[PDB]
Design a protein around this ligand. Structure first.
Ligand code: FAD
Ligand code: FAD
Ligand code: TPP
Ligand code: TPP
Ligand code: UQ0
Ligand code: UQ0
Ligand code: UQ0
Ligand code: UQ0
Ligand code: MG
Ligand code: MG
Ligand code: MG
Lengths: 594, 594, 198
């Protein structure tokens, strides 16, 4: 029971009781006592990153992989904590938690300029639910106790706990047998709110459900699908809700927005007369101008967070609720409505939505050399199984990937949708693989994103963490070239150079095969579209043989303008569209996934 | 004269008038109008980094290379600014400026959750002299005007200017002919302060001058040397003052402190009876416990910043002054004292200091295989000229480098002494080379530091920026292994693995030769100490032939404990010491530098 | 049912549903729409103080008198909010709530040094559970809703809600019949812990 121990030793017991099994980090002097407590206790597997920013995005990928996970990022004082701010922001921005833990100078030296002492508490406050420097050894378990409550409760978000060196080694009395995690706070909608929501839905003639990341955050995907099935209401996932209903489900109507969106999704939204928003916010890249998004449409918004309702547009009905609590009641009420014969038939509207989905496509089957990126995603859809789990960040790489890939389960699209920090992809994919070694992880990056934290590939090598990284290389910051067209500009966005060690990259600059191999991984370069499929097959084999990350690099044409625009009804199609399966053969309507 | 133009166009004129010629950055949508204004104006050379953190440390190296430089770091909204916090902290910590400029969401969307909008103003305030989101296009030139005043005035520090997209493109009237930079504020010591300081110095029997980074910040190195020469007072540079008097000068008595210090420096400090502090603070890694540092010693402290005086110890005389202003008066008064025959002769004390410098050494001439790191620095001292400019960060690599290398001019030790963020080295070295293409830049990194921002080597390749990067590889976070010995720990600090592409690295993990070559650079690996010197000669030749960075990787023995301790009189010597030149042949006392 | 009304009218219904019956305050131009909403709605008795600090300590005493009470203090922009800081500190320090409502300059003028405009949200943050300038009229009922959850939950403490003039008078749709106070968060000890203490 009760025993004297260092505060960091008590921290290990608290972390174990809170369900922690894994951590990502970089040690240093100020945080060594915690690493000492970690070795003494056992039970936490540590993964050494090759940049603190890498440890922080591994923690994010780990949280995002499986409901209830909380990725832990560990580092020392000073610049370790400032290297975590981007992940804290990215996690806050998407409403998911990570636990960052930093060492700090001893308390009695905090406002001297002690070597590598920084006011991380002040720096991190804007991007966290709590950021605190612990000033008493006895408070170390209590601060972690409150941190876990906050990471799980309400709108989730991350916490940073900063530990002065003397506070870590100080002796306290602690009884692990008596430690208990705090209850989690989640408001639940009342039956009166839900019945009103269902009455309005029944009165709608052309409704859609917009299913957001809150559905996934709540672990409520099956209830979301069940509710749409009972009501026969087509579902539009936001980018953060993608996967909560399978992409080949008859009611999944595509995605909506200015960029990661389908032509049929935007058309179905503009044709609808109600948006039943569950666990979404209404993000600007999803809505365009809100006046157009809402024209002629009733709007329902269910959100766990009161100050998200009415933030960007006025709902006709706002309801504060956890999405699982709300969907449980939504299923119950809809079942009562169905037994009563009060749910309308929706065959025509569903058929109209399915007709747009069959016809309003974008071409992917390009035989061009140099390769067209949209062909890469067609080959990815064929190569990988229905259980594929994609990890990606930002770039034309990622935008077209969301337009053209398909996903069939929640937490199989792992994407930092609101903050999009370049370099996120490799560490996030490693964190997912650490969360679930059976998961079939495939990452997508453009060349610039791949370069930011390219050294994290050696983490996969050292720890034998296998996954496939698709690398689509245009030797450009392609997304930025495209947005510079508005200024008739093409300026400081090219990565090309004649590589003095590799004439075979033909002026594309960095040799990603040589870099990946030097970092202990396997790599294949593809120049022709017909070689993409064999390469993915070789990659699966090399992954099994060597158990390390395997990079498949596809050399792209330098310039491809991905479809996008400023309003739902203004998306410009630069590349060829399609109305036939031959040009877009991996749309779920034409292809059986696995 | 007067003309309508975009606020970013006026920003270009202001930057030109303020002396800006170079910028480092990563563009994106929110900052595109500024890149557009940069292309239209000409006159700023942009260097594209391969991580925003890389652009930010390039800006630091550029500032640090030449007095009056201000490195500029450019990036977009959201995670670009959070990727700059580590450099802002590192620049603040050493009292040097950089100008960070971020794009931002349009004003009318600032507290909506606009895509990639973050409250960078709040996040950056703790690590900057000013961090402001500009809310009127007409204020853009005025905010830059105040930023340059603050970066130059008082205790220098960095500024972040955040630019909403609509503010950037808005039209203003601006007359570049009428723009004038603000006057710079620097307090100057009165003659009464300086005469009192010189009286106390004259009364001292065994004084030393501790010369800090403020001397270099003020561009006052020649006056510092002249004052020591007039008074015949030995000079101890802090790590940030290193180079303000040449290492082979008869009065340069070595460095002092817990780690980057000489055995003779610490002995001379403890034997002294006054510390005449000029432009130093008294950092904890320099003093140890202040009660021991000051025992039996009068203390003078001259600092430009009033709240630095008395911060960690009580001076007998504190003086607020710019170091150049103070040294100008110090030279004048000492000359008046010398004409009056009032300066004491100091032959015995100077001879006693020189005797410690001749005798209290650490061995570097090791023929061991695997190589001993101290041998690398001996070879570096012989290979490179007196004009060598070293760039380094932290690690046992850097600590022993400061113990064993030698420098002969100010701004030839470029080192982030207070914050030490791993990954700083490559971008900082590239920023120095951009500041001065004739400078003879040689960087030192351990393997972990080298890996953090390893992709920046491709910036050197794409832009043909030549320098030599010495890479001392123990496949360890060596500094952390050593500090873990206090906990009888060796845990999560090893980088080794059997590289499936390189049996020739013999279990050391990452193949830095293959990675450097894939990134477009040249690289040589050295296994035996006698091959170090030829490798540096090949490296100079490859640098001239290809004009790209050239990495020389020395494979070290896995474990070497570098000398260090907790007090000036407690530094533990783990490796062999030396009292003879044969074991330490590159001490300036035994070797003529160039 | 749902109806068009100003944000401050919607605030009156929220305050009524949350049990408010009393307010202590000092009016001014920037909070006049709220006073107009009070007069139209009726059912909140206003006590006019002769110092804003006096209103803010009246609010405290009203809270402390009776379990479940939340004193409400009302002021205009600028110096009114800075006059409430001492009471926000006193209420925080004893773990009891008051609800402070200040008027504020319109959003389009928030960083333009407008007459009697101050960053009260920055000043009050150290002495409150929440201090927020409300930037959308539709958020007024929701900010008030979260404030009442915060003042009742956990360790209780005060809240400052700061209302730009244009936010107060803007029209919104709001259904009073659908408004519901949020559940109060209070952790409970398990039986194992209580048996150990006994
Ligand atoms: C280049 C790029 C292009 C993009 N293009 C698009 C596009 O065209 N369309 C698009 O939709 N997105 C797009 N995105 C993503 C976009 O920026 C947003 O990240 C996303 O739309 C937000 O999803 P959401 O509305 O589900 O909100 P989320 O960020 O997922 O959050 C929604 C709400 O969930 C709530 N919540 C949290 N937990 C719970 C719970 N347990 N119960 C209930 N509610 C809960 C939160 O309070 C929050 O308000 C793009 C991103 C990038 C980088
Ligand atoms: C691993 C490691 C080990 C280290 N070991 C040591 C060691 O043993 N010994 C050591 O000394 N350092 C060591 N350092 C460096 C140390 O941490 C500090 O960075 C350094 O000692 C501070 O130098 P300084 O006192 O000159 O202060 P600086 O940081 O250079 O600043 C000194 C003062 O200059 C003032 N100033 C600025 N501009 C002007 C001006 N124009 N005129 C006058 N004053 C001005 C500022 O106000 C400031 O107070 C180490 C660093 C690392 C990473
Ligand atoms: C840290 C950071 N800086 C800048 C950006 C802005 N940004 C978005 S996409 C992009 C270029 C990405 O290029 P690449 O990964 O090669 O993808 P491509 O668009 O070429 O497919 C940039 C700089 C960002 N998201 N994060
Ligand atoms: C971002 C960051 N995280 C952690 C540290 C702490 N730290 C100081 S030295 C070191 C290891 C450096 O290893 P390497 O560069 O290989 O040098 P070696 O000591 O082995 O010569 C670490 C992690 C730091 N300075 N910065
Ligand atoms: C990509 O590197 C860059 C150049 O290289 C050609 C340029 O010419 C310019 C103007 C900007 C730049 O970033
Ligand atoms: C029969 O299965 C199919 C659907 O579901 C009915 C569809 O909605 C579409 C577009 C195609 C299809 O094959
Ligand atoms: C360097 O990677 C690491 C290991 O690998 C052997 C370990 O066994 C442990 C315990 C920590 C770690 O970071
Ligand atoms: C003659 O030159 C020399 C010195 O300066 C006198 C010294 O201080 C030392 C230690 C050696 C030396 O050779
Ligand atoms: Mg690219
Ligand atoms: Mg990197
Ligand atoms: Mg090392």
């Amino acid at each position: 029971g009760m025993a004297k121990m260092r505060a960091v030793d008590a921290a290990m017991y608290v972390l174990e009781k809170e369900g922690i099994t894994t951590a990502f980090g970089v040690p240093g002097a100020a945080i060594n006592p915690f690493y000492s407590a970690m070795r003494k206790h056992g039970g936490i597997r540590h993964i050494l990153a090759r940049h603190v920013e890498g440890a922080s995005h591994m923690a994010e990928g780990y949280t995002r992989a499986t409901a209830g996970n909380i990725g832990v990022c560990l580092g020392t004082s000073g610049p370790a904590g400032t290297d975590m701010i981007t992940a804290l922001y990215s996690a806050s921005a998407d409403s998911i938690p990570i636990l960052c833990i930093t060492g700090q100078a001893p308390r009695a030296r905090l406002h001297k300029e002690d070597f590598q002492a920084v006011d991380i508490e002040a720096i991190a406050k804007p991007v966290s639910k709590m950021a605190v420097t612990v000033r008493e050894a006895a408070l170390v378990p209590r601060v972690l106790q409150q941190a876990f409550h906050l990471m799980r409760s309400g709108r989730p978000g991350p916490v940073l706990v900063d530990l002065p060196f003397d506070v870590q080694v100080a002796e306290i009395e602690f009884d692990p047998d008596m430690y208990e995690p705090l209850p989690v706070y989640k408001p639940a909608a009342s039956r009166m709110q839900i019945e009103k929501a269902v009455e309005m839905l029944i009165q709608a003639e052309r409704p859609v459900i917009v299913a957001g990341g809150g559905v996934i955050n709540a672990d409520a995907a099956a209830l979301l699908q069940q509710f749409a099935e009972l009501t026969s209401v087509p579902v539009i996932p936001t980018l953060m809700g993608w996967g909560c209903i399978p992409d080949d489900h008859e009611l999944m109507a595509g995605m909506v927005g200015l960029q990661t969106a389908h032509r049929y999704g935007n058309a179905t939204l503009l044709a609808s007369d109600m948006v039943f928003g569950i666990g979404n916010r209404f993000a600007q890249r999803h809505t365009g101008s809100v006046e157009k998004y809402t024209e002629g449409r009733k709007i329902v918004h269910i959100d766990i967070e009161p100050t998200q309702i009415g933030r960007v547009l006025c709902p006709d009905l706002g309801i504060v609720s956890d999405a699982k609590a709300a969907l449980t009641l939504l299923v119950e009420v809809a079942q009562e409505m169905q037994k009563a014969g009060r749910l309308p038939c929706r065959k025509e509207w569903v058929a109209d939505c399915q007709q747009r989905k069959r016809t309003l496509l974008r071409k992917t089957h390009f035989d061009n050399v140099p390769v067209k990126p949209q062909r890469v995603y067609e080959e990815m859809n064929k190569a990988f199984g229905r259980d594929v789990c994609y990890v990606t960040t930002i770039g034309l790489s990622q935008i077209a990937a969301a337009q053209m890939l398909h996903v069939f389960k929640d937490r199989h699209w792992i994407n930092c949708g609101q903050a999009g920090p370049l370099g996120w992809t490799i560490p996030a994919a490693l964190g997912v693989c650490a969360a679930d070694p059976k998961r079939n992880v495939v990452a997508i990056s453009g060349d610039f994103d791949f370069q930011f934290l390219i050294e994290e590939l050696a983490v996969g090598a050292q720890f034998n963490i296998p996954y496939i990284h698709v690398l689509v290389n245009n030797a450009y910051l392609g997304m930025i070239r495209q947005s510079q067209m508005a200024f008739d500009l093409d300026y400081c966005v090219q990565l090309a150079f004649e590589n003095i060690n590799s004439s075979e990259v033909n002026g594309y600059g960095v040799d990603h095969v040589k870099v990946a191999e030097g970092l202990g991984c396997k790599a294949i370069r593809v120049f022709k579209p017909e070689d993409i499929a064999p390469a993915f097959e070789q990659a699966k084999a090399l992954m099994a043989q060597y158990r390390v990350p395997v990079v498949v690099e596809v050399i792209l044409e330098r310039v491809t303008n991905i479809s996008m625009g400023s309003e739902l009804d203004n998306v410009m199609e630069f590349e060829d569209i399609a109305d036939n399966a031959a040009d877009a053969p991996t749309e779920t309507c034409f292809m059986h996934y696995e």
